[PDB]
Amino acid sequence: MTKIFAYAIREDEKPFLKEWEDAHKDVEVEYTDKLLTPETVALAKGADGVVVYQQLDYIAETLQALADNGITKMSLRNVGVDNIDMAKAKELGFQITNVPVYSPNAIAEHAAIQAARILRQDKAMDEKVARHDLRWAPTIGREVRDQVVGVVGTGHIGQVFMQIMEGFGAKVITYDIFRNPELEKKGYYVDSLDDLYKQADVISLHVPDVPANVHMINDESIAKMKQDVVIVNVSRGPLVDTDAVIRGLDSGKIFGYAMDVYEGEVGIFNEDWEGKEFPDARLADLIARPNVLVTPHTAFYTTHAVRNMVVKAFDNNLELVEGKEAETPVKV
Amino acid sequence: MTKIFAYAIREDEKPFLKEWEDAHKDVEVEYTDKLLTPETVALAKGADGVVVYQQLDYIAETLQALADNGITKMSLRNVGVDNIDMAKAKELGFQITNVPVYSPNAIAEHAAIQAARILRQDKAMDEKVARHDLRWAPTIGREVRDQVVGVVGTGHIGQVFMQIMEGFGAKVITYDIFRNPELEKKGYYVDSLDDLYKQADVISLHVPDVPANVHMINDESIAKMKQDVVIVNVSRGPLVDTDAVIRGLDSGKIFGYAMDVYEGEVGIFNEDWEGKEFPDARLADLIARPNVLVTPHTAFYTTHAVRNMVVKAFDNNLELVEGKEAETPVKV
Numbered sequence: 189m190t191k192i193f194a195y196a197i198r199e200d201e202k203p204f205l206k207e208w209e210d211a212h213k214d215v216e217v218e219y220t221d222k223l224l225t226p227e228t229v230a231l232a233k234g235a236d237g238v239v240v241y242q243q244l245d246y247i248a249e250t251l252q253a254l255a256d257n258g259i260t261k262m263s264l265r266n267v268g269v270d271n272i273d274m275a276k277a278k279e280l281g282f283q284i285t286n287v288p289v290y291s292p293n294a295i296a297e298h299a300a301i302q303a304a305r306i307l308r309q310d311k312a313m314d315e316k317v318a319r320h321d322l323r324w325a326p327t328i329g330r331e332v333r334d335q336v337v338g339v340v341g342t343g344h345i346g347q348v349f350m351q352i353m354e355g356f357g358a359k360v361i362t363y364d365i366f367r368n369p370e371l372e373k374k375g376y377y378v379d380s381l382d383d384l385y386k387q388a389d390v391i392s393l394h395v396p397d398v399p400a401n402v403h404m405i406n407d408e409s410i411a412k413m414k415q416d417v418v419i420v421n422v423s424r425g426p427l428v429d430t431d432a433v434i435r436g437l438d439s440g441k442i443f444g445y446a447m448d449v450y451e452g453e454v455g456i457f458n459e460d461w462e463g464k465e466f467p468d469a470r471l472a473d474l475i476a477r478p479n480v481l482v483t484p485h486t487a488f489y490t491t492h493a494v495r496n497m498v499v500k501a502f503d504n505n506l507e508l509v510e511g512k513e514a515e516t517p518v519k520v
Numbered sequence: 521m522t523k524i525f526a527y528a529i530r531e532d533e534k535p536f537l538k539e540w541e542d543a544h545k546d547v548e549v550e551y552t553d554k555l556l557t558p559e560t561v562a563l564a565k566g567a568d569g570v571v572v573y574q575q576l577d578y579i580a581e582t583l584q585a586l587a588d589n590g591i592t593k594m595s596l597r598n599v600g601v602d603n604i605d606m607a608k609a610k611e612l613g614f615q616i617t618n619v620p621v622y623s624p625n626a627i628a629e630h631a632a633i634q635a636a637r638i639l640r641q642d643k644a645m646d647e648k649v650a651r652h653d654l655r656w657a658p659t660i661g662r663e664v665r666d667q668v669v670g671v672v673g674t675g676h677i678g679q680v681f682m683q684i685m686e687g688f689g690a691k692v693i694t695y696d697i698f699r700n701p702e703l704e705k706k707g708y709y710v711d712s713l714d715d716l717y718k719q720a721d722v723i724s725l726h727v728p729d730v731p732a733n734v735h736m737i738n739d740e741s742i743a744k745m746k747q748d749v750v751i752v753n754v755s756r757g758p759l760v761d762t763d764a765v766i767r768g769l770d771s772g773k774i775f776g777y778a779m780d781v782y783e784g785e786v787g788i789f790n791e792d793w794e795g796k797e798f799p800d801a802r803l804a805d806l807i808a809r810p811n812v813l814v815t816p817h818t819a820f821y822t823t824h825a826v827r828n829m830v831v832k833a834f835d836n837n838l839e840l841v842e843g844k845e846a847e848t849p850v851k852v
């Protein structure tokens with residue numbers, strides 16, 4: 189019937205799902221809150237395609253129970269095409285889409301806000317106020333505009349962050365391996381990551397989790413940095429050696445750290461550990477420091493992003509199902 | 521004894537004070553951390569001028585006492601003059617200066633950051649992360665670029681607030697009783713406040729505490745604002761009817777409120793109440809709301825601001841004392 193079955197649908201997604209349905213009243217759309225598992229495939233039996241979103245791997249077993257239920261078209265509401273048993277997929281002739289770009293501003297705004305907060309010592313101030321210590325001193329702020337902001341990576345997110353930081357009046361330098369000519373005209377780029385580290389008050393990372401960048405922030409890069417540097421990371425956990433940032437924080441060289449991602453987040457992030465034994469003492473410690481901001485991989489999480497995740501996933505699924513060129517197919 | 525006596529000097533001001541003294545060795549400077557009241561006025565005795573900074577009112581009695589000690593020259597380190605008894609000051613031929621522009625950015629950045637935090641539900645997020653609830657859902661954010669931002673007052677701070685909000689990509693509209701040509705050429709201005717209230721997702725006030733402005737944010741203007749409006753006040757408490765905002769919050773109309781200032785802050789703000797009986801249950805309640813951000817009149821509290829507040833104040837005071845033209849004189 190042109191029946192799209194969706195898994196893992198969240199409450200906050202429903203509004204964009206309804207919307208999608210109202211623009212495609214001829215399409216039958218069903219969904220569950222459950223994740224896609226070899227036992228949950230049977231739920232999409234009848235559907236022409238499934239829209240999915242979950243870190244729970246896409247196990248061959250799973251893909252297989254899907255095809256055995258007649259489904260071979262899959263639309264990711266996210267970017268990641270990682271937990272997908274790819275050899276299996278190609279085997280069953282799986283057609284797969286994802287959502288590569290939903291809202292770059294979501295992540296860039298989060299980085300921007302978290303940096304500014306750390307500069308302002310807003311967390312120390314919030315903590316004082318919550319205990320009813322309303323004295324100013326000694327929690328004096330640092331203006332964003334008084335900073336040199338170093339952006340590592342000038343892709344979709346990095347450029348929006350630069351945009352935002354320039355709006356504040358900060359002096360913005362950048363570093364990327366491939367210089368976008370427009371930015372190159374402008375003069376943003378510096379020649380070496382080292383030039384960035386020596387002059388930036390604020391460093392933000394907008395670079396992929398590639399092996400050459402793993403732990404690029406470490407004891408050696410931190411030792412190059414300016415006194416009172418602020419580091420922001422909303423890209424990928426493994427970019428940063430947490431123990432070296434903790435060292436930097438402890439020696440007083442690192443002014444503060446904002447992280448939305450963490451090298452040990454898998455299995456920790458996106459779980460309620462209230463009233464339970466927190467699994468990672470190091471993360472627990474970071475969460476409590478006055479000059480560190482931990483968010484559980486939430487930089488993407490905005491009404492705008494979520495809107496685009498839903499709608500675009502359903503646009504791609506319908507396109508797969510209607511034998512149309514998919515907008516954002518995954519190279520299988 | 522070309523002498524200047526400074527009140528309410530804080531540790532964080534001292535560095536700036538010595539920089540000033542080191543450039544004006546022929547001037548004698550004395551200071552106290554205490555506030556300027558009728559009973560501390562006596563400490564100015566001998567000085568030729570006075571440099572002050574306080575939210576506590578400069579009463580007719582304080583002003584009389586200053587004079588009755590030889591002082592008729594007063595340089596505030598800050599912008600606002602709303603707590604000075606002008607009628608008494610004029611009667612006594614007081615000469616008064618302020619520091620109109622110590623750093624419009626400090627306050628503007630504070631406003632932008634608090635507004636963004638509220639849009640992001642960052643407080644709700646931070647409280648569950650501190651509890652160790654690392655689930656992002658359902659705490660979804662609102663991007664700054666998705667908002668219509670309404671700036672009430674396009675003076676020194678409002679203009680920098682506009683800049684910042686535009687850097688984020690938000691649609692910025694404005695309302696000032698006095699229009700800035702350069703601004704007006706761009707078509708930022710709306711014809712009335714009611715127009716601004718009707719269109720704005722985010723409202724920020726950047727106007728002085730003048731009689732006509734008291735309680736401009738009240739049950740009647742809130743009724744006119746959009747659903748889920750975010751209100752920011754870093755200017756002056758009395759601009760906002762606090763109970764009205766609380767009703768706006770309780771009715772679900774107002775998405776959140778950022779306040780740096782408060783009707784009743786004098787004697788509360790910049791005081792430690794930890795382990796004491798909090799004097800203002802209404803303020804304690806605001807402080808603990810998830811969608812209210814309270815700072816104790818710290819919008820100004822940045823290193824860039826505090827230097828300028830000190831240096832320009834003394835510049836101004838020297839000028840008064842030496843019968844030269846003050847750079848930023850106030851009208852009495």
Ligand SMILES: NC(=O)c1ccc[n+]([C@@H]2O[C@H](COP(=O)([O-])OP(=O)(O)OC[C@H]3O[C@@H](n4cnc5c(N)ncnc54)[C@H](O)[C@@H]3O)[C@@H](O)[C@H]2O)c1
Pocket residue numbers: 295340341342343344345346363364365366394395396397400401422423424448449485486487488489
């Ligand atoms: N925290 C979240 O919620 C969230 C949400 C979405 C994406 N992300 C992350 O954000 C990152 C940014 O995504 P994007 O869409 O901007 O990617 P992109 O491909 O558009 O940007 C990557 C850029 O980094 C540059 N680069 C690579 N290695 C570099 C190095 N060593 N030094 C300097 N520059 C380098 C590339 O040349 C490229 O310009 C992603 O890698 C992803 O992991 C996080």
Ligand SMILES: NC(=O)c1ccc[n+]([C@@H]2O[C@H](COP(=O)([O-])OP(=O)(O)OC[C@H]3O[C@@H](n4cnc5c(N)ncnc54)[C@H](O)[C@@H]3O)[C@@H](O)[C@H]2O)c1
Pocket residue numbers: 599600620624627672673674675676677678695696697698726727728729732733736754755756780781817818819820821
């Ligand atoms: N919280 C803090 O630390 C802090 C620091 C500095 C200033 N402030 C407050 O912010 C105010 C603004 O400072 P600024 O430097 O921008 O002053 P400014 O004089 O440059 O700007 C005030 C502007 O408001 C306009 N205006 C006055 N009443 C208005 C009304 N009813 N509607 C619309 N526009 C109106 C004036 O025309 C002017 O453009 C100061 O008076 C002070 O009360 C607070």
